[PDB]
Structures are given as C-alpha cells and as structure tokens.
Amino acid sequence: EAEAKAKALEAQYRERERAETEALLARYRERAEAEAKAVREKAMARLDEAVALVLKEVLP
Amino acid sequence: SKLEAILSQEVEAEIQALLQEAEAKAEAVKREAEEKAKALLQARERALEAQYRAALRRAESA
C-alpha cells in the first residue's frame, strides 16, 4: 500500500505539475503579446507631437 | 492423574499466555505500522505538494 500510493501520488501529481505549469504559462505568453501590442498602439499615434518641443529646446 | 494434570493445566496456561502474546504482538505490529502508514502517507503527500506549490510560485513569478 505504501509503494502503490507513493507511485500514484508521484506520477499523477507530476503530470498535474506539468499541466498546471503549462496552462498558466501559456496565458503569460498571451499577456506578453497583449502588453507589447498595447504599448505599440499607445506609441504609434503620439509621435512627432513632442519632437518639435525637443527641437525647440536643442536649437538655441 | 491429579498433580501432573495440574502441571499440564499450567502447560495449557502457558498456551494461554502464548496466545495472549500472539494476539498482543499482532495488534502491536498492526498499530505501529498503521501509524507509520498514515505518517508516510502524509509525509510524501505534503513533501511533493510543497514542491509542486513552490514550482507554481516560481513559475508564475518568472
């Protein structure tokens, strides 16, 4: 009984480890892509509105 | 035969004491190994559960 329950615990919860790790990690890749494209969208429209300010400051 | 029939009944009392020790040994071994069965159950469960939990913590943190 000790060996049977030990092997059952080890195998089943090892595959539980792998499944839960993968299931959480995939949505972490999802958040990575989401954050990257969201800051791209925030970046791509607000260009050239401040480069006239930095050219006002650089040129004497 | 009276007095060595009493000696042979002392012998049956030795049989009685031996079966007392037999039942006592069976119950003692079963009890101590039951304690160890439950203790090793909980030991390997909580150990691999803590390893699983710490792997989940460090995985989501990374």
From Swiss-Prot, chain B:
Produces ATP from ADP in the presence of a proton gradient across the membrane. Keywords: ATP synthesis, Hydrogen ion transport, Ion transport, Transport. GO terms for molecular function: ATP binding; proton-transporting ATP synthase activity, rotational mechanism; proton-transporting ATPase activity, rotational mechanism. One of its GO terms (biological process) is proton motive force-driven plasma membrane ATP synthesis. It comes from Thermus thermophilus (strain ATCC 27634 / DSM 579 / HB8). Belongs to the V-ATPase E subunit family. The lineage of its organism: Bacteria, Thermotogati, Deinococcota, Deinococci, Thermales. The gene is atpE. GO terms for cellular component: proton-transporting two-sector ATPase complex, catalytic domain. This is V-type ATP synthase subunit E.
